[PDB]
């Protein structure tokens, strides 16, 4: 999810996004996750 932000054409601008992924092996950091939404047997960790 890509939130609105100032464009990167102008210096000193940041683009803001949220990643929502099914929990699994790989690059996942449960402590730094915003929350871990849960489904039946399947998780979906959303990042800050």
């Amino acid at each position: 999810f890509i939130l609105p932000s100032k464009s990167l054409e102008v210096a000193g601008s940041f683009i803001r996004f949220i990643t929502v992924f099914r929990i699994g092996p790989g690059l996942v950091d449960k402590d730094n996750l915003d929350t871990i939404l849960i489904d039946g047997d399947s998780q979906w960790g959303v990042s800050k």
């Binding site: 929990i23 092996p25 449960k30 871990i36 039946g40 047997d41």
Partner: protein, 44 residues
């Protein structure tokens, strides 16, 4: 050989114990009743 086996055991045990930080409650059917279990890799 003993040091190699110790190193493998230490890595395996730490990896197995690390899986207990991601324990979440689900719903599964044991026998004939749907109960709230607590689930959590298992490297060879």
């Amino acid at each position: 050989l003993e040091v190699y086996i110790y190193y493998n055991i230490k890595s395996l045990l730490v990896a197995l114990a690390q899986n207990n930080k991601a324990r979440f409650y689900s719903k599964v059917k044991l026998l004939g009743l749907t109960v709230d279990q607590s689930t959590v890799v298992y490297p060879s």
